[PDB]
Design a protein around this motif. Structure first.
Motif, PDB file in Angstrom:
ATOM      1  N   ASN A 138     -66.447 -29.260 115.539  1.00 47.21           N
ATOM      2  CA  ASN A 138     -65.774 -27.981 115.439  1.00 47.21           C
ATOM      3  C   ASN A 138     -64.400 -28.051 116.083  1.00 47.21           C
ATOM      4  OD1 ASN A 138     -66.524 -27.770 118.278  1.00 47.21           O
ATOM      5  ND2 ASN A 138     -68.458 -26.868 117.591  1.00 47.21           N
ATOM      6  N   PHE A 139     -63.775 -26.897 116.276  1.00 47.31           N
ATOM      7  CA  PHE A 139     -62.459 -26.841 116.872  1.00 47.31           C
ATOM      8  C   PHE A 139     -62.209 -25.484 117.481  1.00 47.31           C
ATOM      9  CE2 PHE A 139     -58.041 -28.364 117.069  1.00 47.31           C
ATOM     10  CZ  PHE A 139     -58.286 -29.707 117.271  1.00 47.31           C
ATOM     11  N   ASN A 140     -61.347 -25.443 118.487  1.00 51.23           N
ATOM     12  CA  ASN A 140     -60.935 -24.188 119.093  1.00 51.23           C
ATOM     13  C   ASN A 140     -59.507 -23.819 118.694  1.00 51.23           C
ATOM     14  OD1 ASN A 140     -63.232 -23.448 121.112  1.00 51.23           O
ATOM     15  ND2 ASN A 140     -62.884 -25.627 121.395  1.00 51.23           N
ATOM     16  N   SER A 141     -59.069 -22.653 119.154  1.00 53.61           N
ATOM     17  CA  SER A 141     -57.726 -22.159 118.907  1.00 53.61           C
ATOM     18  C   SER A 141     -56.848 -22.393 120.122  1.00 53.61           C
ATOM     19  CB  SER A 141     -57.779 -20.664 118.596  1.00 53.61           C
ATOM     20  OG  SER A 141     -58.623 -20.402 117.490  1.00 53.61           O
ATOM     21  N   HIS A 142     -55.587 -22.771 119.901  1.00 53.14           N
ATOM     22  CA  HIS A 142     -54.700 -23.209 120.986  1.00 53.14           C
ATOM     23  C   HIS A 142     -53.287 -22.631 120.917  1.00 53.14           C
ATOM     24  CE1 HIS A 142     -57.746 -26.460 120.305  1.00 53.14           C
ATOM     25  NE2 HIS A 142     -57.901 -26.288 121.601  1.00 53.14           N
ATOM     26  N   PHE A 143     -52.555 -22.730 122.023  1.00 51.07           N
ATOM     27  CA  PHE A 143     -51.259 -22.478 122.051  1.00 51.07           C
ATOM     28  C   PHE A 143     -50.517 -23.616 122.240  1.00 51.07           C
ATOM     29  CE2 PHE A 143     -52.818 -18.199 123.515  1.00 51.07           C
ATOM     30  CZ  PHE A 143     -52.647 -17.513 122.185  1.00 51.07           C
ATOM     31  N   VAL A 144     -49.491 -23.789 121.414  1.00 48.88           N
ATOM     32  CA  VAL A 144     -48.614 -24.956 121.461  1.00 48.88           C
ATOM     33  C   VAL A 144     -47.240 -24.508 121.966  1.00 48.88           C
ATOM     34  CG1 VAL A 144     -47.468 -26.717 120.042  1.00 48.88           C
ATOM     35  CG2 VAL A 144     -49.828 -26.025 119.528  1.00 48.88           C
ATOM     36  N   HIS A 193     -40.652 -20.875 122.686  1.00 48.66           N
ATOM     37  CA  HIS A 193     -41.598 -20.123 121.879  1.00 48.66           C
ATOM     38  C   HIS A 193     -42.818 -20.986 121.572  1.00 48.66           C
ATOM     39  CE1 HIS A 193     -41.217 -22.118 117.897  1.00 48.66           C
ATOM     40  NE2 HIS A 193     -40.055 -22.505 118.389  1.00 48.66           N
ATOM     41  N   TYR A 194     -43.921 -20.357 121.160  1.00 47.44           N
ATOM     42  CA  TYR A 194     -45.157 -21.084 120.913  1.00 47.44           C
ATOM     43  C   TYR A 194     -45.655 -20.992 119.477  1.00 47.44           C
ATOM     44  CZ  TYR A 194     -47.504 -16.557 121.986  1.00 47.44           C
ATOM     45  OH  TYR A 194     -47.900 -15.239 122.009  1.00 47.44           O
ATOM     46  N   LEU A 195     -46.708 -21.761 119.183  1.00 49.49           N
ATOM     47  CA  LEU A 195     -47.463 -21.671 117.938  1.00 49.49           C
ATOM     48  C   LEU A 195     -48.889 -21.305 118.297  1.00 49.49           C
ATOM     49  CD1 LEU A 195     -46.590 -24.889 115.839  1.00 49.49           C
ATOM     50  CD2 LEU A 195     -45.335 -22.760 115.946  1.00 49.49           C
ATOM     51  N   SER A 196     -49.409 -20.287 117.630  1.00 51.56           N
ATOM     52  CA  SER A 196     -50.796 -19.903 117.772  1.00 51.56           C
ATOM     53  C   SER A 196     -51.579 -20.593 116.667  1.00 51.56           C
ATOM     54  CB  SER A 196     -50.930 -18.388 117.667  1.00 51.56           C
ATOM     55  OG  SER A 196     -52.292 -18.016 117.570  1.00 51.56           O
ATOM     56  N   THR A 197     -52.552 -21.414 117.054  1.00 51.51           N
ATOM     57  CA  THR A 197     -53.236 -22.305 116.122  1.00 51.51           C
ATOM     58  C   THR A 197     -54.729 -22.051 116.028  1.00 51.51           C
ATOM     59  OG1 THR A 197     -53.490 -23.983 117.870  1.00 51.51           O
ATOM     60  CG2 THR A 197     -51.592 -24.162 116.464  1.00 51.51           C
ATOM     61  N   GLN A 198     -55.247 -22.092 114.813  1.00 44.98           N
ATOM     62  CA  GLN A 198     -56.664 -21.886 114.553  1.00 44.98           C
ATOM     63  C   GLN A 198     -57.091 -22.795 113.419  1.00 44.98           C
ATOM     64  OE1 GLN A 198     -56.226 -17.083 115.268  1.00 44.98           O
ATOM     65  NE2 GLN A 198     -54.686 -18.549 114.546  1.00 44.98           N
ATOM     66  N   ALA A 220     -46.143 -18.657 114.385  1.00 49.36           N
ATOM     67  CA  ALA A 220     -45.324 -18.708 115.589  1.00 49.36           C
ATOM     68  C   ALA A 220     -45.104 -17.340 116.251  1.00 49.36           C
ATOM     69  CB  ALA A 220     -44.006 -19.322 115.261  1.00 49.36           C
ATOM     70  N   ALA A 221     -45.108 -17.319 117.583  1.00 47.58           N
ATOM     71  CA  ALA A 221     -44.861 -16.112 118.360  1.00 47.58           C
ATOM     72  C   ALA A 221     -44.075 -16.433 119.635  1.00 47.58           C
ATOM     73  CB  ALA A 221     -46.171 -15.449 118.699  1.00 47.58           C
ATOM     74  N   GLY A 222     -43.996 -15.467 120.547  1.00 49.73           N
ATOM     75  CA  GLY A 222     -43.349 -15.667 121.837  1.00 49.73           C
ATOM     76  C   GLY A 222     -41.925 -15.131 121.935  1.00 49.73           C
TER      77      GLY A 222
END
Ligand SMILES: [Mg+2]
Ligand SMILES: [Mg+2]
Ligand SMILES: [Mg+2]
Ligand SMILES: [Mg+2]
Ligand SMILES: [Mg+2]
Length: 224
Positions: A138-144, A193-198, A220-222
């Motif tokens: 599986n995988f989780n969601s991250h901030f880059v 700024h970051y990337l919200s990843t899922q 992308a957000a931030g």
């Protein structure tokens, strides 16, 4: 490069790898859609059984497909370097275990956005979570977290990937990342700024080889 990322775009991924001496290749085929921030890819181990867990390769196996809000469209470093492309290099440090060093070239070849990677893994512990295949599929969601590099005319990212382990623990894979443009130009250098990843991992039932079906959503957000 934006105009190149309106509508869907076909993707090719190629990865040649070597981890503690075990050599392998991966081929990925699919479609991205940056308007939505959406990837769908199927990767196959072209050489046999994958000597490592499929999840450890996800970040290595096309951040140009990040949906960027219109109020940030100018901080999209990744798209601004197309079609010529970029070099993406990472050090991935698995906590209490080995390290991946990766070098990839991302760019258009005609219509297809191509990712060609070499990966070298060192100092992996026999029957660790990685070589001992103890990681959940599986995988989780991250901030880059991205920031510009004045000097290299590029960007740096920094994030910690959390892999679930069969015992309920979490294997951290610390990511340092460096991107530099290929082609000739000034390119867009972003403020922080970051990337919200899922991401969701799955299997194709009528595929008799070792493979990974991947769905990914990135925006992308931030910045306001
Ligand atoms: Mg291949
Ligand atoms: Mg918006
Ligand atoms: Mg390398
Ligand atoms: Mg050592
Ligand atoms: Mg995170």
């Amino acid at each position: 490069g934006e105009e190149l990322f309106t509508g869907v775009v076909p993707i090719l991924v190629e990865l040649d790898g070597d981890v503690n001496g075990h050599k392998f290749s991966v081929r990925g085929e699919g479609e991205g859609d940056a308007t939505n921030g959406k990837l769908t890819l199927k990767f196959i181990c072209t050489t046999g059984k994958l000597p490592v867990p499929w999840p450890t390769l996800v970040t290595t196996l096309v951040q140009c497909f990040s949906r960027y809000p219109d109020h940030m469209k100018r901080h999209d470093f990744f798209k601004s370097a197309m079609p010529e492309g970029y070099v993406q290099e990472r050090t991935i440090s698995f906590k209490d275990d080995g390290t991946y060093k990766t070098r990839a070239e991302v760019k258009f070849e005609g219509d297809t956005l191509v990712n060609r990677i070499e990966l070298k893994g060192i100092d992996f512990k026999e029957d660790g979570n990685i070589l001992g295949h103890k990681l959940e599929y599986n995988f989780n969601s991250h901030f880059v977290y991205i920031t510009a590099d004045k000097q290299k005319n590029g960007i740096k990212a920094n994030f910690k990937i959390r892999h679930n382990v069969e015992d309920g623990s979490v294997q951290l894979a610390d990511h340092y990342q460096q991107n530099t443009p290929i082609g000739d130009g000034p390119v867009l250098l972003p403020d922080n700024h970051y990337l919200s990843t899922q991401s969701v991992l799955s299997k194709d039932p009528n595929e008799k080889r070792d493979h990974m079906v991947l769905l990914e959503f990135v925006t992308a957000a931030g910045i306001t």
